[PDB]
Design a protein around this ligand. Structure first.
Ligand SMILES: [Pt+2]
Ligand SMILES: [Pt+2]
Length: 129
């Protein structure tokens, strides 16, 4: 599923991400834009042989099992294919673990390089939230 911008803002807000660990909703919307283009089916291989999955590009090195990342962890206790559903619940729940691990949103490279320090409230402009 390719979300619209305000559609995704409303789903993320409903699932408790607005101000989660102090990160406003716009930071999450901005991260999803630049990680996946709002596409729940997005997959991208990493150099180490891991893969990032879903609307928030969660990495099989640590967070999910994809059957082809040997020696990795599964800290969200899920198959990585759960992160590709039209339903973002599994991605949101896993993201809450990630952001709480001490590194905050800096785990998302696209957030760090494209969102951090910018006017992220623009990402929720015009939405009825
Ligand atoms: Pt939820
Ligand atoms: Pt660790």
């Amino acid at each position: 599923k390719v979300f619209g911008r305000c559609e995704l803002a409303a789903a993320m807000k409903r699932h408790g991400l607005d101000n989660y660990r102090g990160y406003s909703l716009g930071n999450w919307v901005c991260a999803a834009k630049f990680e996946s283009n709002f596409n729940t089916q997005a997959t991208n291989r990493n150099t180490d042989g891991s893969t990032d999955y879903g609307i928030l590009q969660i990495n099989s090195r640590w967070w999910c099992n994809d059957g082809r990342t040997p020696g990795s962890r599964n800290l969200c206790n899920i198959p990585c294919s759960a992160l590709l559903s039209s339903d973002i619940t599994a991605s949101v729940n896993c993201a809450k673990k990630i952001v709480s691990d001490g590194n905050g949103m800096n785990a998302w490279v696209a957030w760090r390089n494209r969102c951090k320090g910018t006017d992220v409230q623009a990402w929720i402009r015009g939405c009825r939230l």
